[PDB]
Design a protein around this ligand. Structure first.
Ligand code: ASP
Ligand code: ASP
Lengths: 915, 915
């Protein structure tokens, strides 16, 4: 009641019977405090309470003295007390996030709505799959048969990637899951009062179990990181896929199509980078890739094996067609155990043994390299596994029992067909220099010169000479650095392993046609019988500008064209390009890049798939992902969406089963709509203005980030990037700021609540547009109201500002940055304010997130917890870095490195996605 | 809407937001009809509809022409159409029962209540475990510590037995389960509208799946029947036990006891007869018993194996006491796979392998008699399995994490401790003649005479001479009939198998102390190292009268007394005794028998457990079971309830998880209360009247059932007992009416809706009480209002009359019984009416079940469906029995033996428990 009133003082809540977020947080906190008291004593609970209040008062008034009050309580803790408190706030934050998931899961959809594109920006107002169908028939004049057709031919490929600050352990998500479920159920109307006393107890227990699953730090092998990343299949994706496909079927009945999506239409696919991306990451070896492909194969076949047992129980029926009868009797005769009066079980029992075999073979190969289990007794292609299930389906329909075939059996065909034999196909990624090195080692060995030195024309001439050559390039004889051996051994792994383990070979830092032709040649020479498609990733602005020419050249080369069989994937990386030119300029350039590359594809009759890498507005998750997809340039999806699911977004997207369902839904709805309903194309005046604004934006960003000689120094002091690197959480930080990687660049500035990488340059751009011609404000405002790409671009920056607090960034300056650099920090904070102000005026908003109060509330509630972690972090950095700084310790109330790891992860759990 | 209005015409429904039964039936029927139409054509659906209406109109007005209208539609069906219709009505009946389960599961408990013993007769008003605790502290002056103590020392042993008309297949219960769950959920307030379209579809599908799981008839091996009987463990009992124990814990916190029931207090146990009872059943061989003990061991260890995997996921914690640390490091060193930083998982992984081993060993022995798996690598005693789990519990509590130990780990300790290594312990039962035969074979072989011929005194003298003898009785050399070999081989199975597989050896038709001493000797001579306790089952009235003397003698014999170690179980069988003297007389005799046997036990200082066999008021299930227990004679439970769970009641008791929980609850609540709050003891006037009424009751019943020379003839014509026997559904029917077994006797008369065995004799008794002295009516009425035993006895008979329809029994006469026997049937129907009338006047009721409208409604709703099956059955019996009877067939609209099997099972599914 006091806990609830202090929260409601912080948030002016709402009457909606939906809105219980604050109640959820009160309850969770109250239980958590009780637990703290039981485990660590009243005084420790009191201290946690004291710190929380101080944070609350700060998020209220923003009096900066409150940060120093909190500081003086935090700096006065022996390191054992400091760990327990940083762990409390970390856990309260996670709890807050779980409460949010429950709130979003059960919030009521809004019945009356305008049916304009703004509705698509929020879960509560966005279109579901039936609404999208109906919209397409009614407002775009499509026959249902046409909508059905588009949908059958559509793919959405979600690509899973490493969590930047380490993935949650599988057992911790299950606990989280149980906390959510207890929370949901304590407010259910369907369960009575005494059933609930036990839920209170179950919830209290589960909050404690999660708290005491807290071992710390050798951060984990890439194999271990991959396993943890794959957790969401068991948690929600495995059931969610069939569940969502069944909804599609209902939407279809409701617009007059009586059929179901064929079970083998590949509407949904998952891919993975985990153990495949080695770009600037030498822990990801050849052996690691070999491993994760075996683990994928193992996990998958373990899931099918376990599920088929349930299916077998259900399939008790005795009526079959003669085709199944024949097959059953054969298998029964090999009488090596069910009755023949249960024919479906005879077939499925045989499939079960193959699955078990497929699973042991994989485990053996992982543990030893050898299996006594022969490939003949195992599944090596997904069609071998589908065939007998197709036979069951047919047999049931033939006997008049389609309605039964359409239950669990149909769910299973869809699972098999969506997940295939692994659950995910692995992309490989490596940077083009590393290919050039391999090729230079070869040219020097052959005594024909230095490939590195050759011009792009000469490279091409030679690479095409070898790709039509009749003669192998090199052997094992070849003298290799370690790095060159690593690239070759990777290709050997691709040659040994089956082609259903893989998808794309992504070339980082791609710039030329030779970049792609080099990988094609290496694949062929390493004897990859079925080469992975090669996908260039264009990173720098200059690189995006030349991309279209590069693709024109590739497509005009007979060998490549033939090889590519009318399909090409190109990858873009928003964070990467933004690190080179600033976010605004990169946003515009990538809109144009996509138009231009699509144009070139059309001209050569090549189907082009744009693979969205991290940092884009489609990575946000939730409603915003819906409008983001709808806002893609015309024809840039054309039935194939490939998109990165950022690790810092996966829990929110897929952890809770309703949210998982809505994620799959919105990816399908928006893809289908876009291909038939592109957004409006910009007015010429808008394009002109965007070009002008980009030039200015880029000049601002670059002068600060690359031309200010003391910038890197400032960045290393104000920011924990050096300590992120040295306590490496994941990869490793540089390969100056050109050299630093995207993820560390975003993470450094997110941790100080300043977020420079997201907003810098927007201010110069808007300021200059408006001084040049006051009318530009109105145009900028009109662009916001009517151009989806622009709306969505501003919305993401607005959201990032909501997560911003220049107070916190000033505290880091004060504590960590030398006095000579303070005016620099201060000018950067002046830039923040100005940039924000312009963003607000363009959006027509007085405060941040006025258009999105549900998001506003969520963020404001987390901020109490994050803020404590930020203060703790700031003063801990001061203690680690400065031996001259000492501060008197309280007597014990219930290892600075440990505290810092804890705060870095917490602030990352709290900030989730930004840029 | 038309379907719903025709149902509501049949039942004057109610406003309660609870009461949705009629809606549930409308929905289920509407879907079912759609399915029938899809599978068999509009005309077949129409015919089913036509028959249902006719039945409806009959249950409305009771115009007997409607039965013949239905007859003429049913007799005019080719046998393929007849099968499909009998199957429709069978399925509609099952559906009705599923709807009932959902209605009972979610009906609201009544808050305001008198707190007299009548409240305990209904689920809605009965006391839960907290109410019972509070009652005992408040109204009986017990300290909570005393109540806690009684409860720790209490056992309830539920003994599972064969379904009399064949157990439902395991896969069919799961389907049933899913129909219930879809039904519940379609009315949930917590799930929104679109989620529901899919439930409609899921329910329609599941009603169809159940319908097409319908293979017919070699009725099943006893092994197969046992497996099907054990289904309820997976379905609800496995989780229900821990769930109910946790409730007990909450009830305890709420009366001020801060502890939990120790995990190893044996509050709940299950036993089994399946594969153990061979009394008049030679399909139950030695080998069958060997088998079911192995299957029990296998199923159990399979469940523990699968559950421990979940537990292992949860037990991620790293803090342990040193005792667990030591053990973990040992196991890890035998490094033959988890990290040692996860000590609970190292311990539980080792337990998992033992469980897997325990499970393979059992399977091998079942399939071959030999296992390569040694007994050393397996669990052979439940304490070996508990010990490491106890170690986990302790370690968690020591480290401050009791709250975590009290979750899943505690659930698991309770499961292990409740179920032990098998899930159920097997009782053996055999009739005493068969022992006498064995002993006569021995005495003749030894050339000392004929044990059969010896007097009871001589038997005892000899059996005690051999039980103190120093010299074995016989070898393999012994000349044996097949029957005598079968008894010896059974005892050899008990000698070979471990003693945790077994419980009681029940002697059917027990009458003398030598009966029990004979089995003790046989056990010892067959080298059963740990002999099963021997339990006499007294069946005839005369036998119940001499029971107390028999037990006095046994207890006064030093050898037996020493052997028995202060514990003896005696079994009673209500149906059995009722077959000898009529229900009323048996009810009274067994009240007195129990008083007398308890008295004798007290005198000798022996703890006496009464084992309730079938047919008693405690077998009803639901609320009535609660009052039944409370009505036992004083001191006859004394902390140990052993009771039969009749197969025809198991689904209702345990199929749905709420009902399962309430079943366990009420057995605990009522047992605990009774031991501290016996019912009032009868007034002398009441005892006198009961004795007078019994003498008369017995004379009526016996003169009709045993002394009427044409009775057996009448019974064989009016009743399908001959066809129950010959199409044997289970056992086999006789060993005249003395010879016939209880179950067939009850089943024959239930099938004609006449139920003679339950009510015959009550009429003579009441009539005579009242003519003797008109005041006796008032006393009889007072007994009903204030003596629980009497209330409960009348209530069961009242319920049976609600299931009665003398119209149906008249139709069977008309069709099947020769005209010369019609006045006999008619006098029996006059007796029915008169008996009913008296029962109503005694109860203060104008109509049947006026005290229990919820039960009234349930029964009236089933009756529509049953009635069709009854008509179908009657005319099918006429066709099978009379080649001279032929009746013209409709052209086909979409095997008489098959139709009959179907109707017999349906009517049994519909009638459930009677006597
Ligand atoms: N993912 C949310 C922000 C957050 O939940 O942190 C959004 O992009 O709006
Ligand atoms: N078992 C119920 C009757 C029934 O459901 O058939 C009772 O004894 O009241």
């Amino acid at each position: 009641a006091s806990i609830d009133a202090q929260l409601r003082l912080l948030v002016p809540g709402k009457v909606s019977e939906d809105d219980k977020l604050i109640e959820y947080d009160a309850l969770l906190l109250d239980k958590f405090l009780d637990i703290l008291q039981d485990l660590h004593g009243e005084d420790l609970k009191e201290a946690v309470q004291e710190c929380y209040e101080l944070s609350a008062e700060y998020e209220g008034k923003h009096d900066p003295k409150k940060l120093e009050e909190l500081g003086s309580v935090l700096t006065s803790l022996d390191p054992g007390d400091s760990i327990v408190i940083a762990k409390a706030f970390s856990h309260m934050l996670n709890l807050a996030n779980l409460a949010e998931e429950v709130q979003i899961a059960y919030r009521r959809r809004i019945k009356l709505k305008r049916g304009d594109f703004a509705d698509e920006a929020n879960a509560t107002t966005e279109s579901d799959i039936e609404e999208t169908f109906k919209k397409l028939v009614l407002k775009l004049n499509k026959s249902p048969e046409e909508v059905f057709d588009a949908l059958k031919n559509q793919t959405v490929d979600l690509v899973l990637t490493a969590h930047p600050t380490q993935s949650v352990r599988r057992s911790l998500l299950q606990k989280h899951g149980r906390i959510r479920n207890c929370l949901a159920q304590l407010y259910a109307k369907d369960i009575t009062p005494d059933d609930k006393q036990e839920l209170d107890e179950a919830l209290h227990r589960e909050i404690q179990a999660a708290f005491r699953t807290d071992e710390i730090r050798t951060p984990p092998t890439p194999q271990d990181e991959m396993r943890a990343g794959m957790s969401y299949f068991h948690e929600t994706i495995w059931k969610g896929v069939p569940k969502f496909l069944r909804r599609v079927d209902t939407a279809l009945k409701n617009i007059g199509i009586n059929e179901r999506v064929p079970y083998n239409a590949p509407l949904i696919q998952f891919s993975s980078w985990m153990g495949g991306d080695r770009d600037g990451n030498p822990r990801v070896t050849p052996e690691v890739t070999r491993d994760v492909c075996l683990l994928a194969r193992m996990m998958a076949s373990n899931m099918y094996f376990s599920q088929i047992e349930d299916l077998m129980f259900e399939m008790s029926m005795w009526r079959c067609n003669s085709e199944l009868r024949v097959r059953a009797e054969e298998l029964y005769r090999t009488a090596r155990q069910v009755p023949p009066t249960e024919p479906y079980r005879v077939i499925l029992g045989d499939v079960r043994d193959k699955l078990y075999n497929t699973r042991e073979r994989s485990r053996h190969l992982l543990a030893h390299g050898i299996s006594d289990i022969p490939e003949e007794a195992v599944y090596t292609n997904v069609e071998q596994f589908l065939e007998p299930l197709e036979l069951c389906y047919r047999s049931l329909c033939d006997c008049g029992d389609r309605v039964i075939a359409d239950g669990s059996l149909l769910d299973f065909l869809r699972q098999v067909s969506t997940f295939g034999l692994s659950l995910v196909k692995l992309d490989i990624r490596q940077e083009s220099d590393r290919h050039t090195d391999v090729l230079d080692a070869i040219t020097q060995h052959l005594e024909i010169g230095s490939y590195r030195e050759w011009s792009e024309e000469k490279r091409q001439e030679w690479l095409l000479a070898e790709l039509s050559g009749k003669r192998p390039l090199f052997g094992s004889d070849l003298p290799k650095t370690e790095e060159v051996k690593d690239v070759l051994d990777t290709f050997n792994v691709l040659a040994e392993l089956p082609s259903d383990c893989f998808g794309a070979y992504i070339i980082s830092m791609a710039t030329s046609p030779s970049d792609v032709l080099a990988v094609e040649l290496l694949q062929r020479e390493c004897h990859v019988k079925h080469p992975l498609r090669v996908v260039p990733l264009f990173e720098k602005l200059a690189d995006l500008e030349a991309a279209p020419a590069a693709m024109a050249r590739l497509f005009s080369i007979d060998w490549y064209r033939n090889r590519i069989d009318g399909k090409q994937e190109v990858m873009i990386g928003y964070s990467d390009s933004g690190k080179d030119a600033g976010r605004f300029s990169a946003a515009w350039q990538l809109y144009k890049a996509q138009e231009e590359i699509i144009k070139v594809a059309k001209e050569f009759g090549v189907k082009l798939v744009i693979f969205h890498g991290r940092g884009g507005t489609v990575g946000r998750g939730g409603g915003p992902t819906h409008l983001a997809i709808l806002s893609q340039p015309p024809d840039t999806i054309h039935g194939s969406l490939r998109v990165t699911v950022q690790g810092e977004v996966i829990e929110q997207s897929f952890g809770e089963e309703h949210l998982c369902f809505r994620t799959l839904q919105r990816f399908c709805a928006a893809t289908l709509e876009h291909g038939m309903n592109p957004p409006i194309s910009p007015r010429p005046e808008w394009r002109e203005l965007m070009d002008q604004m980009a030039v200015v934006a880029t000049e601002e960003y670059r002068s600060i980030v690359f031309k200010e000689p003391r910038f890197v120094e400032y960045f290393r002091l104000a920011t924990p990037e050096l300590e992120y690197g040295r306590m490496n959480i994941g990869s490793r930080p540089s390969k100056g700021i050109e050299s630093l990687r995207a993820i560390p660049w975003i993470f450094a500035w997110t941790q100080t609540r300043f977020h420079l990488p997201v907003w810098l340059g927007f201010g110069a751009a808007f300021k200059h547009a408006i001084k040049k011609d006051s009318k530009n404000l109105q145009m900028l405002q009109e662009m916001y109201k009517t151009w989806p790409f622009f709306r969505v671009t501003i919305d993401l920056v607005e959201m990032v500002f909501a997560k911003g607090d220049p107070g916190i960034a000033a505290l880091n300056d004060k504590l960590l940055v030398s006095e000579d650099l303070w005016p620099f920090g201060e000018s950067l904070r002046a830039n923040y304010e100005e940039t924000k102000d312009y963003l607000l005026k363009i959006a027509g908003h007085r405060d941040l997130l006025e258009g999105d109060p549900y998001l506003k509330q969520r963020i404001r509630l987390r901020d109490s917890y994050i803020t404590t972690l930020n203060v703790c972090q700031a003063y801990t950095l001061k203690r680690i870095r400065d031996p001259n700084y000492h501060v008197t310790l309280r007597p014990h109330i219930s290892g600075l490195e440990d505290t810092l790891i804890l705060t870095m992860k917490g602030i990352a759990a709290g900030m989730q996605n930004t840029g």
